[PDB]
Amino acid sequence: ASTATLCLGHHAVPNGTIVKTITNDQIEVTNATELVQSSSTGGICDSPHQILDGENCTLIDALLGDPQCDGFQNKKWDLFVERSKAYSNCYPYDVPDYASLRSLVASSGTLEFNNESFNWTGVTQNGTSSSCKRRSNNSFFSRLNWLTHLKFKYPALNVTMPNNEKFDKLYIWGVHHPGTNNDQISLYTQASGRITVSTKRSQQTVIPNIGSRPRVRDIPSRISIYWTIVKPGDILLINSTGNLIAPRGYFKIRSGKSSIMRSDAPIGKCNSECITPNGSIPNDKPFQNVNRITYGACPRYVKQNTLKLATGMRNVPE
Amino acid sequence: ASTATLCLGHHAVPNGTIVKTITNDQIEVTNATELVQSSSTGGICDSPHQILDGENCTLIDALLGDPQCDGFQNKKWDLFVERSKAYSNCYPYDVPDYASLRSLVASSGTLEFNNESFNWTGVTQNGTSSSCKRRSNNSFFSRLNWLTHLKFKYPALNVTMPNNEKFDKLYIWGVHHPGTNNDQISLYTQASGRITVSTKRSQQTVIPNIGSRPRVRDIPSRISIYWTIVKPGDILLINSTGNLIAPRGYFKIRSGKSSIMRSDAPIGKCNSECITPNGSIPNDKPFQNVNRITYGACPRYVKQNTLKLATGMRNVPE
Amino acid sequence: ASTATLCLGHHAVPNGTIVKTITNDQIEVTNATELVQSSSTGGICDSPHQILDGENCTLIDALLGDPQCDGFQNKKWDLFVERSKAYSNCYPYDVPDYASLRSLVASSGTLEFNNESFNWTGVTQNGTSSSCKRRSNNSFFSRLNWLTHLKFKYPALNVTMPNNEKFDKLYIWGVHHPGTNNDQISLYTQASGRITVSTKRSQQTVIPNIGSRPRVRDIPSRISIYWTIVKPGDILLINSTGNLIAPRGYFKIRSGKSSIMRSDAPIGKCNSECITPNGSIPNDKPFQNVNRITYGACPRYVKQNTLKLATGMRNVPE
Amino acid sequence: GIFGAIAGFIENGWEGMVDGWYGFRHQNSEGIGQAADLKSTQAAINQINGKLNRLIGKTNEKFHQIEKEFSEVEGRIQDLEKYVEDTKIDLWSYNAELLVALENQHTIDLTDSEMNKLFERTKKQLRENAEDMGNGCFKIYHKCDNACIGSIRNGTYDHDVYRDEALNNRFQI
Amino acid sequence: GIFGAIAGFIENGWEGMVDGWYGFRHQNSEGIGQAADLKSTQAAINQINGKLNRLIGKTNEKFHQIEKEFSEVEGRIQDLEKYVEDTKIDLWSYNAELLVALENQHTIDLTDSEMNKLFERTKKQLRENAEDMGNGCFKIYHKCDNACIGSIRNGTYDHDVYRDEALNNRFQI
Amino acid sequence: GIFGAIAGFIENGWEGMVDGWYGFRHQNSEGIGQAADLKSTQAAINQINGKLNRLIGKTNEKFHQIEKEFSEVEGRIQDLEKYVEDTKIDLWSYNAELLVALENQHTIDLTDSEMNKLFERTKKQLRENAEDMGNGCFKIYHKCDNACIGSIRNGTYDHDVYRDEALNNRFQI
Ligand SMILES: *[C@@H]1O[C@H](CO)[C@@H](O[C@@H]2O[C@H](CO)[C@@H](O[C@@H]3O[C@H](CO)[C@@H](O)[C@H](O)[C@@H]3O)[C@H](O)[C@H]2NC(C)=O)[C@H](O)[C@H]1NC(C)=O
Ligand SMILES: *[C@@H]1O[C@H](CO)[C@@H](O[C@@H]2O[C@H](CO)[C@@H](O[C@@H]3O[C@H](CO)[C@@H](O)[C@H](O)[C@@H]3O)[C@H](O)[C@H]2NC(C)=O)[C@H](O)[C@H]1NC(C)=O
Ligand SMILES: *[C@@H]1O[C@H](CO)[C@@H](O[C@@H]2O[C@H](CO)[C@@H](O[C@@H]3O[C@H](CO)[C@@H](O)[C@H](O)[C@@H]3O)[C@H](O)[C@H]2NC(C)=O)[C@H](O)[C@H]1NC(C)=O
Ligand SMILES: *[C@@H]1O[C@H](CO)[C@@H](O[C@@H]2O[C@H](CO)[C@@H](O)[C@H](O)[C@H]2NC(C)=O)[C@H](O)[C@H]1NC(C)=O
Ligand SMILES: *[C@@H]1O[C@H](CO)[C@@H](O[C@@H]2O[C@H](CO)[C@@H](O)[C@H](O)[C@H]2NC(C)=O)[C@H](O)[C@H]1NC(C)=O
Ligand SMILES: *[C@@H]1O[C@H](CO)[C@@H](O[C@@H]2O[C@H](CO)[C@@H](O)[C@H](O)[C@H]2NC(C)=O)[C@H](O)[C@H]1NC(C)=O
Ligand SMILES: *[C@@H]1O[C@H](CO)[C@@H](O[C@@H]2O[C@H](CO)[C@@H](O)[C@H](O)[C@H]2NC(C)=O)[C@H](O)[C@H]1NC(C)=O
Ligand SMILES: *[C@@H]1O[C@H](CO)[C@@H](O[C@@H]2O[C@H](CO)[C@@H](O)[C@H](O)[C@H]2NC(C)=O)[C@H](O)[C@H]1NC(C)=O
Ligand SMILES: *[C@@H]1O[C@H](CO)[C@@H](O[C@@H]2O[C@H](CO)[C@@H](O)[C@H](O)[C@H]2NC(C)=O)[C@H](O)[C@H]1NC(C)=O
Ligand SMILES: *[C@@H]1O[C@H](CO)[C@@H](O[C@@H]2O[C@H](CO)[C@@H](O)[C@H](O)[C@H]2NC(C)=O)[C@H](O)[C@H]1NC(C)=O
Ligand SMILES: *[C@@H]1O[C@H](CO)[C@@H](O[C@@H]2O[C@H](CO)[C@@H](O)[C@H](O)[C@H]2NC(C)=O)[C@H](O)[C@H]1NC(C)=O
Ligand SMILES: *[C@@H]1O[C@H](CO)[C@@H](O[C@@H]2O[C@H](CO)[C@@H](O)[C@H](O)[C@H]2NC(C)=O)[C@H](O)[C@H]1NC(C)=O
Ligand SMILES: *[C@@H]1O[C@H](CO)[C@@H](O)[C@H](O)[C@H]1NC(C)=O
């Protein structure tokens, strides 16, 4: 009357992990894996995305032609990285809808600039100022042309420029607001008159407003920046009597995967597809708690700092 | 010692279907059903929604009274369908916040227009232009009144119109921007002066800007369109000295299920509750991959082109 | 050959509840619990949030200093409650981007006002009007200063005020639009001229527009309200020639959990963390069908009015 | 239920059972009695309370948001605000509908599971001394006084004591 | 399947079975036959139809919304409209992917469950007159004519009639 | 677990088992040994790897979006941008919380299921030669040398060889 015994069973481990389920906020399993990326290496990887470090320059300063940003001329980028240390070091300016211009340029992803020979007859070109020095000599925004009188006269400008190309043209121009009446007349020999940049499909008119603003870099005047997009078959019509900061050409507009990010993280020679303002992070996990701002193939941001996915059975010690 | 055998089992089929589960991206079941609508019949069904084919006319052109859009006067619609072939064939115009006016009119769902006898004493009415021909004779927007001088004089207009009704009134008006100084004076005998349309609850003032724009349909001038909503007990006050493109009445504003869609699909005599720019689609399935733009009882748009729901057991061939 | 019987079983109840599952829209279980809060007590609880009942005053009226809102000076709040009965009882005014000013003030959560001795030399201060009575005597907005000529002269104002503090300053100012030419000259002895409030980082210029608007409280004129935020190290520069409704100081700007709500529910002496325009509701349940507008720790709004969560087994009567 | 016990081979529940969710009914020479099983009852209750803890008492603090009712026609910007809120409400409404459906399906399955566990527990206790009649009842092939029924209910029934008596009654011609 | 019947101890399905989803095959002195079980087949079908009713035929009416295609560059406002719609589409796409995965896993589990319920039902019917061979087949230890097989299929098989014959054949040396 | 094996009638796991997730322990005249079952271990692992493949390695490319941090007070438009992003984050945070809870509940249930399948597999192999003791262990009523234990472990145990010996030991008075 001999017998035997056969017991079925499962394994267990001495170091289990707590996970959540539908019915239990704390249940221990043999193994788990983290689904939330919570740490950053620290630095932004210069690959595989084309990074452009703005250094002391904002995107708009490089666009206009701030002398300290001349190295940026005609550069492309997948991601433009603006630094908090940045500062404008040229003629004081403001942009109505600054955020929108910054966005559409960042989304375009290029600063390619083609020069066009505008017919400025009867006017002086290449105006300069002591507040915008280039090579220690008085200069101006590299992509803008400060127009002034020639023989103490400033005639009505009615200039034309057609877009006979296959692509769109982005024109950046501005209006000068002299700080005093005497400056208006010594610059344009006339009382401030409105400017009008128009196309077959649009129309923008601006009034120069003379008056003193708080001085910045020893300048009580101001420049206001505007932009116009001219599509193929359309024409750019400038209609001014003074105070015009004219364009020297146009920028190309592209459509793609480019953008811009505010960050103070250093650029390194590594390879990572996901970029946050804190630096690049791995993207093996489906979620991340590092930063809501991301660029590239990134995990989705969530508020939890940890989420354990069970990869083993329940742990039952002896 | 006789016996028998009884085997329990399940069916299987020779033509199974692959589906996804939580643990398996490819598992075969006996039958499944598609949950993503991915195909369009091609055409928009004129039922059960009241469709209005814009043909050569945009919604704004019908609103203003473009001669080729006179058949649209006082029409209603559930869905207004704009065509890409559309074009304006009247006086050149632009609308500040064009998108918003287009939206609130589309959401209102009607072009019902009541005429009101504005008291335009001391001025000439019914101005015309060769660029806006109706029946081969020079005309203008059917709902706008181009005012001009009478005996070489244009007095200050201070006209009143009260909303003693039970509903809101939508007023569409405009400002004329003559292309030259001589045109301003031969039209209004005065230098361009600002217009001011006001109510107890609002105030809009516009400055006419004389100057040449690129010619469109042989017209260097421009008209700028504005709108005002006057609620019951309120009053419309027009205060101009020239350059006024006045209203001939007001539009009714309604609240409902109306909207507008851009599409080039033909209208057919069928019945389908869901409309996309690609045409009407069945709405039996809960999701669709046809177009993110929809009107009516539609499946929700998703990026997947297929999602199989298992409607049978796992398939296990012999 | 004696035997016994042992039956295993489960309980059941005479009053079951219907619930939904994945496979069944109607299945009865022994017990369930409601997950959608669908009823409101009726009143707003004055605890634990600091409620401020606006009564007859909007937030903007208290901000400007409408006489019937003087009791509100320097008040704080977690939630500001605006009533539909509210009405303005002072000088007629409008605010460009009224919604944004209302929002940023509501989010700031305070009306703390510091007076600053602006240097208004060569001008008369404390202008009054019969439409804004305080204590039955003609007065004005408590936080605004209506400036007028002194000895039949109004010189060009070029006043300065620096923000040498550690916080931001919110300045509320306005522009007067006289209803007639004679009013402009008897007020400011000059034709209406533009105003310009500027800082190192911003610039706002306004043109007074003379002309009649529909009378409100027996006033054909109008005031337009604007605001400026001056950050530390920056300066406020006012540059006007008349029509200026100047500030008497600045408001503090804070960042926190404050907001504003439209409601006609009475305030009661109860304690409830969730506030809706219908009144306070319990927040034990995870969802609510009362109102999409909420403040505080609230259940999330959903369209369903009921969702039963099964808290027992399936019910099977005998 | 996915185990086929509740609303399955258990024909119906017991309304006379008020001291527990699961239990035993018996018949022997001493009469007919009813008693509740505490372990299985407590297992189901604890799982359901676990569901409630996750869902009850946990809400979200929101303060300053966007406007959601409008008294004037504004156009583009207003359309976006209405759309954002409508989009939000539909997604949360979907989450609430799916959550309750999934939770309720799981609750019905887990209470059916506890019934089956108790049935399996009891079947193994009896070894060769009883046979399953098919409707959740066991025919026990030996004299079973009240104290013997009690021993089965709290897991101290010794099957070897009655095995000889039971095998004789099961395998009699 | 979580019960191990379909694609488990049932080696494969029957393509020759076209009148039902589950059923019986038998062999006796009168031949070899096949018949479908209606109750288990109908239980699985009704649960799947219940899933379809929730998912099919229920759609949402939307009329005036926001613009989703743009012909001009506008900047900030346009970026928000594109972002809102992209955010919406991704969340609904996620819901659709998870829904189908969960539903399909549950459908495979519930059809495996119905197979197991029928197996359990039949096992209890036979009591001590049959033994489970391990592959979903029972060896019945007594003469089983077609009418006797029929009685098992619609739940009227009386095990006491054949118990003596069956126990003798099971416990023979 | 919903099958009551793990943390159920299996009292605890085996830390000494490092070559598999499930297995067998035995005692016979030749000693006491342990061996892992490969099929059940691999079934659980493959299902869990299937979960990971869906969740790991699959991310979404986003490039130009909206601004999410602001240095100036702007009012209405800024309120909408903050609200849109806050709405998005809360919905995804909810999805992540529900996903992990559902996945973990299913993972615990499926590993409990594989334990039960192996138990059922083994029970059917032994037919009438063994009895279930109730704690996952079988009493085998015949001499079982190491080679005989091996035959049970890889599914080649022939029950007819020992049936006569086993029935005699089971039904002895
Ligand atoms: C309106 O008033 C402001 C001040 O109340 C005037 O701005 C100031 O113009 C003076 C020139 O007389 C500047 O003084 C100079 O300032 C520098 C400091 O950067 C100092 O080093 C020089 O020695 C000299 O004192 C002053 O800085 C400047 N401040 C500003 C612009 O904020 C303004 O000119 C007046 N407007 C008009 C149109 O008169
Ligand atoms: C500012 O300059 C532009 C061109 O540089 C002027 O616009 C042009 O005005 C002339 C009239 O002298 C138009 O010429 C005519 O054009 C048609 C072509 O459509 C042609 O068939 C006629 O025979 C004649 O040559 C020209 O088209 C027109 N172009 C525009 C408006 O784009 C404009 O008049 C100048 N502004 C002022 C205020 O003088
Ligand atoms: C433009 O025309 C409107 C009316 O067509 C004028 O507004 C009106 O001005 C008169 C003063 O002559 C006001 O009349 C008074 O009205 C009150 C009613 O509140 C009445 O009780 C008095 O006895 C007197 O009749 C009238 O109310 C007022 N209506 C408005 C402003 O809506 C306006 O003055 C004209 N504009 C100009 C610049 O002349
Ligand atoms: C816990 O489970 C995870 C997921 O299966 C295992 O993580 C893997 O570890 C192996 C090394 O054996 C790597 O090849 C994989 O790339 C890892 N994947 C992940 C997502 O981390 C992990 O090894 C298991 N841990 C233990 C201690 O068994
Ligand atoms: C746009 O250009 C036209 C033509 O160049 C300007 O019109 C001339 O303006 C001068 C100076 O104001 C006048 O003296 C002439 O009488 C005008 N000439 C013609 C041919 O009409 C017009 O002023 C410009 N507009 C703006 C806003 O600068
Ligand atoms: C990544 O950087 C962000 C800042 O852009 C950090 O998020 C902030 O953390 C700081 C404190 O260091 C707080 O002042 C902010 O209020 C936080 N903002 C948010 C949205 O959380 C974030 O903590 C950093 N993350 C890591 C991992 O370094
Ligand atoms: C697969 O399952 C679907 C869903 O149950 C069946 O689709 C139905 O087919 C019937 C015709 O027998 C129609 O009455 C229904 O309207 C269909 N519904 C759907 C959603 O398509 C389908 O018949 C099954 N296919 C097979 C081959 O059995
Ligand atoms: C609004 O209307 C008033 C009155 O009709 C205008 O004021 C008159 O304007 C004329 C011409 O400009 C002057 O000569 C008169 O002295 C004014 N009359 C009165 C009664 O004041 C006013 O100009 C109009 N405003 C606008 C912007 O057109
Ligand atoms: C429905 O029409 C839309 C266009 O409005 C199509 O979606 C586009 O497909 C074209 C190529 O035909 C691409 O150029 C676009 O980039 C697509 N846009 C999007 C958002 O996908 C869509 O493919 C059409 N669908 C069907 C079924 O015809
Ligand atoms: C139905 O189940 C709910 C949830 O477990 C029970 O609701 C609780 O009732 C008790 C009183 O016994 C309170 O302590 C709890 O605060 C209640 N919670 C909720 C969410 O309501 C309820 O008692 C059960 N109903 C019945 C009749 O058994
Ligand atoms: C801003 O202030 C300056 C100086 O106070 C004003 O310029 C003076 O204006 C008066 C009256 O217009 C003129 O007569 C003087 O010639 C100017 N003085 C100086 C020192 O230039 C200017 O007008 C003001 N600007 C505005 C828009 O009001
Ligand atoms: C809470 O108040 C809101 C109003 O702000 C109510 O919702 C409205 O109900 C009214 C009828 O009383 C309708 O005219 C509106 O169209 C409704 N709006 C919405 C968004 O539903 C709501 O019914 C009230 N709720 C309770 C419980 O009193
Ligand atoms: C940026 O500016 C700082 C001083 O403001 C200067 O020291 C530094 O060299 C500048 N860097 C570049 C790249 O111009």
Ligand SMILES: *[C@@H]1O[C@H](CO)[C@@H](O)[C@H](O)[C@H]1NC(C)=O
């Ligand atoms: C530039 O434009 C003027 C118009 O005033 C014209 O007279 C002149 O010929 C143009 N110059 C050239 C080089 O075409």
Ligand SMILES: *[C@@H]1O[C@H](CO)[C@@H](O)[C@H](O)[C@H]1NC(C)=O
């Ligand atoms: C202005 O500068 C450019 C190059 O910087 C030159 O080509 C052009 O001739 C200059 N114009 C004048 C009027 O000096």
Ligand SMILES: *[C@@H]1O[C@H](CO)[C@@H](O)[C@H](O)[C@H]1NC(C)=O
């Ligand atoms: C639309 O315009 C085209 C030419 O542009 C013309 O041939 C066609 O007849 C027009 N259709 C209508 C309905 O006016």
Ligand SMILES: *[C@@H]1O[C@H](CO)[C@@H](O)[C@H](O)[C@H]1NC(C)=O
């Ligand atoms: C029209 O308004 C004028 C105001 O200038 C008034 O004199 C005239 O009587 C009005 N005409 C009618 C018909 O009321």
Ligand SMILES: *[C@@H]1O[C@H](CO)[C@@H](O)[C@H](O)[C@H]1NC(C)=O
């Ligand atoms: C203008 O035309 C309308 C109809 O088109 C007519 O009733 C009105 O009398 C006309 N006015 C003049 C001044 O001719």
Ligand SMILES: *[C@@H]1O[C@H](CO)[C@@H](O)[C@H](O)[C@H]1NC(C)=O
């Ligand atoms: C509010 O206004 C009404 C009349 O409009 C008045 O009766 C009431 O007393 C006012 N309440 C307060 C608190 O001023």
Ligand SMILES: *[C@@H]1O[C@H](CO)[C@@H](O)[C@H](O)[C@H]1NC(C)=O
């Ligand atoms: C106020 O400003 C004026 C500038 O016009 C100045 O002359 C005067 O001294 C200032 N008053 C005081 C008290 O500083």
Ligand SMILES: *[C@@H]1O[C@H](CO)[C@@H](O)[C@H](O)[C@H]1NC(C)=O
């Ligand atoms: C204006 O009123 C304030 C207090 O209301 C007073 O301090 C100031 O002196 C007054 N100014 C004049 C010019 O009366």
Ligand SMILES: *[C@@H]1O[C@H](CO)[C@@H](O)[C@H](O)[C@H]1NC(C)=O
């Ligand atoms: C089980 O119940 C019996 C009563 O029938 C009791 O004697 C015994 O102690 C109980 N077992 C325990 C408490 O472990």
Ligand SMILES: *[C@@H]1O[C@H](CO)[C@@H](O)[C@H](O)[C@H]1NC(C)=O
């Ligand atoms: C079951 O089937 C048999 C035929 O084998 C039939 O005689 C009997 O009536 C059926 N049982 C029913 C209908 O309840």
Ligand SMILES: *[C@@H]1O[C@H](CO)[C@@H](O)[C@H](O)[C@H]1NC(C)=O
């Ligand atoms: C099972 O294991 C035995 C060893 O005990 C071996 O002889 C037999 O071949 C194995 N069965 C196979 C490989 O199918």
